[PDB]
Amino acid sequence: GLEAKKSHILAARSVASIIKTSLGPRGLDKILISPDGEITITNDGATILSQMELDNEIAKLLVQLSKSQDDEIGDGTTGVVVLASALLDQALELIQKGIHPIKIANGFDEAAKLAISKLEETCDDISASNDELFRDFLLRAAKTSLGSKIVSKDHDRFAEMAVEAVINVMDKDRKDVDFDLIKMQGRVGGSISDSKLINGVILDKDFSHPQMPKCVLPKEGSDGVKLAILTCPFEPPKPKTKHKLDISSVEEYQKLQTYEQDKFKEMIDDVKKAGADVVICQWGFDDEANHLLLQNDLPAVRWVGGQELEHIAISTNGRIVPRFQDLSKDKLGTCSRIYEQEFGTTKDRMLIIEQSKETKTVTCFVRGSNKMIVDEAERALHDSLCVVRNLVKDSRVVYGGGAAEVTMSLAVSEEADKQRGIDQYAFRGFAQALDTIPMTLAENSGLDPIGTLSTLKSKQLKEKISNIGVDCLGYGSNDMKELFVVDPFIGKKQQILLATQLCRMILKIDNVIISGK
Amino acid sequence: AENARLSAFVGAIAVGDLVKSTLGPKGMDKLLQSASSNTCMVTNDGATILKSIPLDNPAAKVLVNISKVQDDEVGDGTTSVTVLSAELLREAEKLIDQSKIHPQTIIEGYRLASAAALDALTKAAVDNSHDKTMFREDLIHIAKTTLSSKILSQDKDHFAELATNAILRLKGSTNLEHIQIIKILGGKLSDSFLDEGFILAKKFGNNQPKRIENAKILIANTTLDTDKVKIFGTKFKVDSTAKLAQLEKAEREKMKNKIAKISKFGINTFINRQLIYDYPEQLFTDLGINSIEHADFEGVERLALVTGGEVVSTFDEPSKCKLGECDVIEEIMLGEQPFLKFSGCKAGEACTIVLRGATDQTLDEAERSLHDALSVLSQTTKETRTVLGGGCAEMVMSKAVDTEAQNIDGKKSLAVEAFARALRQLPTILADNAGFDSSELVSKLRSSIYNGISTSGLDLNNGTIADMRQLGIVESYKLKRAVVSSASEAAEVLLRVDNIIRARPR
Amino acid sequence: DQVTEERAENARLSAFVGAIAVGDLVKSTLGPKGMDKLLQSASSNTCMVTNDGATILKSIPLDNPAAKVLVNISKVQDDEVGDGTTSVTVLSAELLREAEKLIDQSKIHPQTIIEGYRLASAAALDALTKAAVDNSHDKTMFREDLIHIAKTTLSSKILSQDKDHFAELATNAILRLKGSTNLEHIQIIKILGGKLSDSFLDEGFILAKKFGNNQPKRIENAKILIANTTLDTDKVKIFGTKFKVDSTAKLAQLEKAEREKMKNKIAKISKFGINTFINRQLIYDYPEQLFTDLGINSIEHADFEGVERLALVTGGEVVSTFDEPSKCKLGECDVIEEIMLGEQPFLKFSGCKAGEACTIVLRGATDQTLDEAERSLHDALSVLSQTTKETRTVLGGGCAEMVMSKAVDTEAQNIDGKKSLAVEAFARALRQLPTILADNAGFDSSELVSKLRSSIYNGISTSGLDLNNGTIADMRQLGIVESYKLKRAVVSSASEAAEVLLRVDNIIRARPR
Amino acid sequence: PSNATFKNKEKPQEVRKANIIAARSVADAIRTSLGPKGMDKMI
């Protein structure tokens, strides 16, 4: 009956109590232990719920909800999912009051519709501004929100490179953002402030022979080596089926080697006839073919993945080569400079390919002082092309940080008294639970939750500016406009809508039947 | 704070207390006894210690990754990296609980202290660069600082001349594969020899001469094992054994034609990657050419850097590629097994250091000493700044940390001063192994730097305060910056843990 | 066999953590703002919730001998202060914790650490003696300062919010005793029900017994007699006697002689001229009717503890051997009547002949407060009685521990050497006692204590910590003051007990029988 | 200016939580027996 309601709510309250300290830039990190012992330290609620022992299906629904939310903005994931959990406590009282669960779910849906028009009131328009202000706004927008962990001290070095990375991949005609073109690397050593940005593709793997020269000199061409991608395996042709070679004489058995010796020569000559220098493939090399490969000054790499060749094909602007018979001068790539650098002490090297002209392949060099930081860096390094994708899709820009949730709550609260009926205790219960985001910011910053609402009510109500919010950085002003706390309109709009759509299901749960796994 | 972080503080300190006896030049080595294979290893460096020890605390396993960073970058004195982070966890047990301060604020106090620590390391750095005459002579005393942290220090003055002449033969080579370290059982550490050439642990053939002058050495990746392997999925189709007996015998002459192509080079020495059959081995005797085999991978690679040659697979052209030449290749028997001693290399492309010791545990452990010492010599050539160690660097930073605490003031000064107090505990732990008075030595060093004397330092040999420049204690800026910046950020992540999630074991 | 012995390696760490683990429960009980604890007993399924560790730590089984001596010395604190005495175990635990960090840093021999506490305790006695204030020279301010002394010592229990109603209880009661230090004179009765503030101080005695049958509930101008003689059981003998008779005629004569035994016994009682009679044991039906025929009150079932309190409060004397009627004294009260307090009606006495003792009526909401108010009133007037003997007092409430820190810091400069580390460690551990007190009220123990530390060094003795407002307030304005005799025994015994625990290099566990 | 905090033990309710739950089971018992519309029990 109704006893199962508290069973699902207390299960979410235990999860919300754990991630309560995970909200805001001042929050703390959880350790994620794998069954094999691998340690993962991150503040992302989606990653914490990804690897964990979960019983109730509600915790699994939070992962499905985080999949669509992480694809919108990509920061402050804790300050989103937990907002829907606070509505269960307000709905628990409505169950004690006798309100039907459907009347509770339909009440949260109608109250969330008014938040669309109130949020777009004061939103700034960045489309009228030029590309200079577009880069200045995006630069200082993430600095507060982006880093929740570790490098969030020195993150200013990462923010400057994150803005210059999108300019190369995004043309000036309209605005277009593709986050699959820019890869994400990482290293263990040095310091976190040594990260650099080079225009081109960077392969983490190095040459397969010790005597291969590390750096290449410019030549009569673009100064590149005219890199080409060879998909065909490097080896003498082997029939995929069985082959029986009849040997009637010593010459027939000796000429079997003469074949592959000529195949190794013709394979290398075709590279010299076209003028190519560095040629990489997916498969390995032979023992005898490495000598003629080195003597002809033809650096090469083996066991190259297919995902890396995608960004390489964009930098070279060539074509994929299925067979050695397709090698030609017109199919060669165009690059500027290619350098190879050894990293920690004895650690392996990497091929950094530079592009003089503006291209769509930008690889940001990543360096870090701990392996746990690198696993943490996977979430921390690149949120950028997800955040700017919301700015380029919708030019409306608002200011977050807990300020807008209180403003839109008072707007719905005033509209709740106009409808009266059962919508009074309903809409007010929804707006009253939306203050948990700034209230949690008052937990880390050590501010009075009662004084938190009284401060924003004495300002955002009388004054039309809604930017008044909780300051966790310890400054002398609560205005988010001066402190440069920026969240995208359409991005934060989805975070509010998807959080309310979660209550259309959980609130209606009555009977649960779990069959054997 | 209480149940959230419990074993993260005391548990990490208990791990550092085990390696506390390993810190410092007067420290001692810990025995690592594995529960499996019944083996053992004796190592001072915490890279191997923390890796093989079972760690129930997840925070202790994080200390292994930060140890691997200092293992590759520095590798010597890495014990103080995890110990310095353990003292920050002890001070966090109070300020967070007793003083009731949010952990992020304590972290922010260390964040501002880390920025002030970098300013004290750069301004106090001493620039040794330009002329390499006094520079190389100073490298003798500069190396002795981090050269021996072990009980083997009796070899300091002996290996000081060998390590100095090692980089002299490299002539600016920053690759650690260009140096050859040989580990030989028996003898004494003072019996280590350094010559120009390479000494291989293999031997020559049966009839190969013991002394050959002006020999031309050439290696290759081919396989002389037997016959010809050809391609995959072959077979022999013949009418009878008359043709089959000829096919097997003719390929022995076909390989001789490849050996006849070797004779066109005029080389006096041949080296093969894989094993060699007796028939092509005897053909090398008729031509008077030495043979070397049984090299898995690096066997032919280590000799290529010394001789400066090139792997020739085809043997087609006696013009291009490379031909290496050594003055005297004579086989010289050292210890029990006979060794192949090369001398008079064509160039200084590589070098070889021979080490001898009675205990096998001394050979493996002292290998890391010269391996890390040459890395320091390469950093002193690149990075031109050096600092002074021996407990003095921690008190100099404490002067800058206490200075910044006066500007910040507030309640964050408790976290800033705790960072300075954590820097005061490192020389206390450093001098704890020597067994001398902590209150006497620290007070004389801490007060002397506030008086304007930065040349003082802790002397654990005589148990007093002496000049680090006279005793020859010098640390490069690359070594000091890598340890402080990593250890300051190592505990920064450990203080961010508000909960412990234990997964179900497999 | 099966003897587990720990050398100086294991015993040094195990002995220090033993007092810290169990000591964490008594750290939150310090001061009026301190909290309480709960204990689950496996027998009878009872519990005791109080801030005094004398009834807490005694019922907690512990295998660490370090806290065993801390429980035995609590009886000395139970004989002196009795309220808020957990600081003895808290300060001792801090001395063990600071010495544990002192041996891990200074690494001096433990005997040298003890020698530092010996010189540090001498400086603490000088600060308390020079700051001692004796107001007994003025009788007007002396009776008013007893209220200020009361307000400090009478805040323990959850009911301390009623201290304003309970301050008048101990103020007038200590004036009625006039030098009576014994609790046997003080009459403490428990009553279930009524409001928490309903407790009042009445002049007289309150008896929980009643009258058997015909005894009038209201008797005026009565002579109270206390007798240990046997009534209910009558003939019980205990001789070497046996009974042999020829016929049932003389059998009834023995019962007739039993009547003559009581008729001659009541005749000697009638010669006393008393309207009230009290027995230690029960009263048989036959003398019960004789008491009503002669107009004599009957009171029975007075135990060994209650038979004394009757004569001690009323000033009477327990009378036996009735053959001497005029050789003893008879108690007298103005009004003897039965009243109703709570559910059970009680017998009230008024106008006692001797005002040497008083009766404190205690009414409360729950049974948990019955034993809780008993512990708060265990030492109440006795604490005020010790102030009547030793009249030198000093401002308490956490400031006195800070005043002694200035004397220890001053003595540490004259000592110096390597023994000053243990002397300074005693000063650092002593300043942590008010720090834990500030932690109990949830206020700031960092900025406030730091200001109180500099205020003592600036020469202000009256500076202290305010519990209600959480600020710096003078103890003379708040009225927080403690006697010199109580605080001297708390600081000295805490340091003497800590010297023994630091001397344990071995722990031997014998095989249980 | 932040300061504040004053937390130390992070589970002050842990002792006072399950006891209210144990008291709620007793409290929910009288809710069914309250008023003339209530219910009876058997022991």
Coordinates of C-alpha atoms in Angstrom, one line a residue, chain C residues 168-484:
Chain C
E168 CA 16.0 29.5 46.2
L169 CA 15.9 25.9 47.4
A170 CA 19.6 25.5 48.1
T171 CA 19.9 29.1 49.3
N172 CA 17.6 28.9 52.3
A173 CA 18.4 25.2 53.0
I174 CA 22.1 25.8 53.6
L175 CA 21.1 28.5 56.1
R176 CA 18.9 26.0 58.0
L177 CA 21.6 23.4 58.4
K178 CA 24.1 25.8 60.1
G179 CA 27.1 23.5 59.7
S180 CA 25.5 20.1 58.9
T181 CA 27.7 18.4 56.2
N182 CA 25.9 15.0 56.4
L183 CA 23.3 14.0 53.9
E184 CA 21.6 11.9 56.5
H185 CA 20.3 15.1 58.1
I186 CA 19.1 16.4 54.7
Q187 CA 15.7 14.9 53.8
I188 CA 15.4 14.2 50.1
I189 CA 12.1 12.6 48.9
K190 CA 11.1 11.8 45.3
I191 CA 7.7 12.4 43.9
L192 CA 6.4 11.4 40.4
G193 CA 4.1 13.8 38.6
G194 CA 3.5 17.6 38.7
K195 CA 5.3 20.4 36.9
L196 CA 9.1 20.7 36.9
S197 CA 9.0 23.9 38.8
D198 CA 6.6 22.6 41.5
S199 CA 9.6 21.7 43.8
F200 CA 9.5 23.8 47.0
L201 CA 11.3 24.0 50.3
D202 CA 9.1 23.3 53.3
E203 CA 10.0 23.5 56.9
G204 CA 9.2 20.2 58.5
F205 CA 9.3 16.5 57.6
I206 CA 7.5 14.6 54.9
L207 CA 6.6 10.9 55.6
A208 CA 5.5 8.6 52.8
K209 CA 3.6 6.3 55.3
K210 CA 0.0 6.5 56.4
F211 CA -2.3 5.7 59.4
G212 CA -3.5 2.2 59.7
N213 CA -7.2 2.3 60.8
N214 CA -8.6 4.7 63.3
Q215 CA -5.8 7.2 63.7
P216 CA -7.0 10.7 63.0
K217 CA -5.3 12.2 60.0
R218 CA -4.8 15.5 61.8
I219 CA -3.1 15.6 65.2
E220 CA -2.1 18.9 66.9
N221 CA 0.4 19.2 69.8
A222 CA 1.7 15.7 69.7
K223 CA 4.7 14.1 71.3
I224 CA 6.6 12.0 68.7
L225 CA 8.3 8.9 70.0
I226 CA 10.7 6.6 68.1
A227 CA 11.1 3.0 69.3
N228 CA 13.1 0.1 68.0
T229 CA 11.0 -2.4 70.1
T230 CA 9.3 -5.3 68.4
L231 CA 5.5 -5.2 68.1
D232 CA 4.1 -7.1 65.0
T233 CA 5.7 -10.4 65.6
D234 CA 5.2 -10.4 69.4
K235 CA 6.1 -13.7 71.2
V236 CA 9.0 -14.6 68.9
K237 CA 11.3 -15.4 71.8
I238 CA 14.5 -16.9 70.6
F239 CA 15.4 -18.6 73.9
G240 CA 16.4 -22.2 74.5
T241 CA 12.8 -22.7 75.5
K242 CA 10.4 -25.4 74.5
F243 CA 6.7 -25.8 75.2
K244 CA 5.1 -28.7 77.2
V245 CA 1.6 -28.6 78.7
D246 CA -0.8 -31.1 80.2
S247 CA -4.0 -29.6 78.9
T248 CA -5.3 -26.9 76.6
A249 CA -6.3 -24.8 79.6
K250 CA -2.8 -23.5 80.2
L251 CA -2.3 -23.3 76.4
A252 CA -4.7 -20.4 76.2
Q253 CA -3.1 -18.9 79.3
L254 CA 0.1 -18.4 77.3
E255 CA -1.9 -16.3 74.8
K256 CA -3.5 -14.6 77.8
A257 CA 0.0 -13.9 79.1
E258 CA 0.8 -12.5 75.6
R259 CA -2.1 -10.0 76.2
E260 CA -0.7 -9.2 79.6
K261 CA 2.7 -8.8 78.0
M262 CA 1.3 -6.1 75.7
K263 CA -1.0 -4.7 78.3
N264 CA 2.0 -4.1 80.6
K265 CA 4.0 -2.8 77.6
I266 CA 1.3 -0.3 76.5
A267 CA 1.0 0.8 80.2
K268 CA 4.7 1.9 80.1
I269 CA 4.0 3.6 76.8
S270 CA 1.0 5.3 78.3
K271 CA 3.2 6.7 81.0
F272 CA 5.2 8.6 78.3
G273 CA 2.3 11.0 77.6
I274 CA 2.7 10.8 73.8
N275 CA 0.2 11.4 71.1
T276 CA 2.4 9.9 68.4
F277 CA 4.3 6.6 68.3
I278 CA 6.8 5.3 65.7
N279 CA 8.3 1.8 65.4
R280 CA 11.1 0.5 63.3
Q281 CA 9.1 -2.7 62.5
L282 CA 5.4 -3.3 61.8
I283 CA 2.7 -2.9 64.4
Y284 CA 0.5 -5.8 65.4
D285 CA -3.3 -5.4 65.4
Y286 CA -3.6 -5.6 69.2
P287 CA -1.3 -2.7 70.0
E288 CA -2.6 -0.9 66.9
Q289 CA -6.0 -0.7 68.6
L290 CA -4.4 0.3 71.9
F291 CA -2.8 3.3 70.2
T292 CA -6.3 4.4 69.0
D293 CA -7.9 3.8 72.4
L294 CA -5.3 6.0 74.2
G295 CA -5.2 8.5 71.4
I296 CA -1.7 7.6 70.2
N297 CA -0.6 7.8 66.6
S298 CA 1.0 4.8 64.9
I299 CA 3.8 4.7 62.4
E300 CA 5.4 1.5 61.2
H301 CA 7.9 0.0 58.8
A302 CA 10.7 2.6 59.3
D303 CA 13.9 1.1 57.9
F304 CA 17.4 1.7 59.2
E305 CA 17.9 4.8 57.1
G306 CA 14.5 6.3 57.8
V307 CA 14.5 5.7 61.6
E308 CA 17.5 8.0 62.0
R309 CA 16.2 10.8 59.7
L310 CA 13.1 11.1 61.8
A311 CA 15.0 12.1 64.9
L312 CA 17.7 14.0 63.0
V313 CA 15.3 16.4 61.3
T314 CA 12.9 16.8 64.3
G315 CA 15.7 16.8 66.9
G316 CA 14.4 13.8 68.7
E317 CA 16.0 10.7 70.0
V318 CA 15.4 7.0 69.3
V319 CA 14.1 5.5 72.6
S320 CA 14.4 1.9 73.7
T321 CA 14.0 0.1 77.1
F322 CA 10.7 1.7 78.1
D323 CA 11.5 1.1 81.8
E324 CA 13.0 4.6 81.9
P325 CA 10.2 7.0 80.8
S326 CA 11.7 10.3 82.1
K327 CA 15.3 9.6 81.2
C328 CA 14.8 10.3 77.4
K329 CA 13.5 13.1 75.3
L330 CA 10.4 13.3 73.2
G331 CA 10.0 15.0 69.8
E332 CA 7.4 17.7 69.2
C333 CA 5.9 19.2 66.1
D334 CA 3.3 22.0 65.8
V335 CA 1.1 20.5 63.1
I336 CA 0.9 16.8 62.2
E337 CA -1.4 16.2 59.3
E338 CA -1.7 14.1 56.1
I339 CA -1.4 15.9 52.8
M340 CA -1.5 14.8 49.2
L341 CA 1.6 15.2 47.0
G342 CA 1.1 13.6 43.6
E343 CA -0.8 10.4 43.6
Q344 CA 0.5 9.0 46.9
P345 CA -0.6 11.1 49.9
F346 CA 2.1 11.9 52.4
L347 CA 2.2 12.7 56.1
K348 CA 3.4 16.3 56.7
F349 CA 5.1 17.6 59.8
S350 CA 5.2 21.3 60.7
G351 CA 6.9 23.3 63.5
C352 CA 9.8 21.0 64.3
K353 CA 11.5 21.5 67.7
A354 CA 15.0 21.6 66.1
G355 CA 15.6 23.4 62.8
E356 CA 19.0 21.6 62.4
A357 CA 17.7 19.9 59.2
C358 CA 15.2 20.6 56.5
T359 CA 13.1 18.6 54.0
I360 CA 13.3 19.3 50.2
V361 CA 10.2 18.3 48.3
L362 CA 11.1 17.1 44.7
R363 CA 8.4 16.8 42.1
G364 CA 9.3 16.0 38.5
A365 CA 7.9 15.0 35.1
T366 CA 9.6 11.6 34.5
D367 CA 11.3 8.8 36.4
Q368 CA 14.5 9.6 34.6
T369 CA 14.6 12.9 36.4
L370 CA 14.2 11.3 39.8
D371 CA 17.7 9.7 39.8
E372 CA 18.9 12.7 37.7
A373 CA 17.9 15.2 40.4
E374 CA 19.3 12.9 43.0
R375 CA 22.7 13.1 41.3
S376 CA 22.5 16.9 41.0
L377 CA 21.5 17.1 44.7
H378 CA 23.9 14.3 45.7
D379 CA 26.4 17.1 46.5
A380 CA 24.4 20.4 46.7
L381 CA 24.4 21.7 50.3
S382 CA 27.5 19.7 51.1
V383 CA 29.3 21.7 48.4
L384 CA 27.9 24.8 50.1
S385 CA 28.9 23.3 53.4
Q386 CA 32.5 23.0 52.2
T387 CA 32.4 26.7 51.3
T388 CA 31.4 27.4 54.9
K389 CA 34.6 25.7 56.1
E390 CA 36.9 26.9 53.3
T391 CA 35.7 30.4 52.4
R392 CA 38.4 31.2 49.8
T393 CA 36.8 31.3 46.3
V394 CA 38.0 32.0 42.8
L395 CA 36.2 32.8 39.5
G396 CA 35.5 29.6 37.6
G397 CA 33.8 28.7 34.4
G398 CA 36.9 28.1 32.2
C399 CA 38.8 31.2 33.1
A400 CA 40.6 29.9 36.1
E401 CA 42.3 27.2 33.9
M402 CA 43.5 30.1 31.7
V403 CA 44.8 32.1 34.6
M404 CA 46.9 29.1 35.7
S405 CA 48.3 28.9 32.1
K406 CA 49.9 32.4 32.7
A407 CA 51.6 31.1 35.8
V408 CA 52.8 28.0 34.1
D409 CA 54.1 30.0 31.1
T410 CA 55.9 32.4 33.5
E411 CA 57.5 29.5 35.4
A412 CA 58.5 27.8 32.1
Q413 CA 60.8 30.8 31.4
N414 CA 62.6 30.5 34.7
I415 CA 63.0 26.7 34.2
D416 CA 63.9 26.5 30.5
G417 CA 66.2 23.6 29.7
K418 CA 64.7 20.5 28.2
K419 CA 62.2 20.0 31.0
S420 CA 60.2 23.1 29.9
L421 CA 58.7 21.0 27.0
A422 CA 56.7 18.9 29.5
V423 CA 55.9 22.1 31.5
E424 CA 54.6 23.8 28.3
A425 CA 52.7 20.7 27.4
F426 CA 50.8 20.9 30.6
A427 CA 49.9 24.5 29.8
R428 CA 48.8 23.6 26.3
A429 CA 46.7 20.6 27.6
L430 CA 45.2 22.8 30.3
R431 CA 44.1 25.4 27.8
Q432 CA 42.3 22.7 25.8
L433 CA 39.9 22.0 28.7
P434 CA 37.8 25.2 28.1
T435 CA 38.2 24.5 24.3
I436 CA 36.3 21.3 24.7
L437 CA 33.8 23.2 26.8
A438 CA 33.2 25.6 23.9
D439 CA 32.8 22.6 21.6
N440 CA 29.9 21.3 23.7
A441 CA 27.7 24.3 23.1
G442 CA 28.5 24.3 19.4
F443 CA 30.1 27.8 19.6
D444 CA 33.5 29.0 18.4
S445 CA 36.4 27.4 20.2
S446 CA 39.0 29.1 18.0
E447 CA 38.6 32.9 17.9
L448 CA 37.0 33.1 21.3
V449 CA 39.6 31.0 23.1
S450 CA 42.4 32.9 21.2
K451 CA 41.0 36.2 22.5
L452 CA 40.7 34.7 26.1
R453 CA 44.3 33.5 25.9
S454 CA 45.6 37.0 25.1
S455 CA 43.3 38.6 27.6
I456 CA 44.9 36.7 30.5
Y457 CA 48.3 37.8 29.4
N458 CA 47.1 41.4 29.2
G459 CA 46.5 41.4 33.0
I460 CA 42.7 41.0 33.1
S461 CA 41.8 38.3 35.6
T462 CA 38.0 38.7 35.4
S463 CA 37.8 37.9 31.7
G464 CA 35.9 34.7 30.9
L465 CA 33.7 32.8 28.5
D466 CA 30.0 33.4 28.3
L467 CA 28.0 30.2 27.9
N468 CA 24.6 31.7 27.0
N469 CA 25.7 34.4 24.4
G470 CA 28.9 32.7 23.4
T471 CA 31.1 35.8 23.9
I472 CA 33.7 37.3 26.3
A473 CA 32.0 38.2 29.6
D474 CA 33.2 38.8 33.2
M475 CA 32.5 36.0 35.7
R476 CA 31.7 38.6 38.4
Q477 CA 28.9 39.9 36.2
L478 CA 27.5 36.4 35.4
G479 CA 28.1 35.2 38.9
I480 CA 30.3 32.2 38.2
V481 CA 32.7 31.5 41.0
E482 CA 34.1 28.3 42.6
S483 CA 35.8 27.6 46.0
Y484 CA 39.5 27.2 46.3

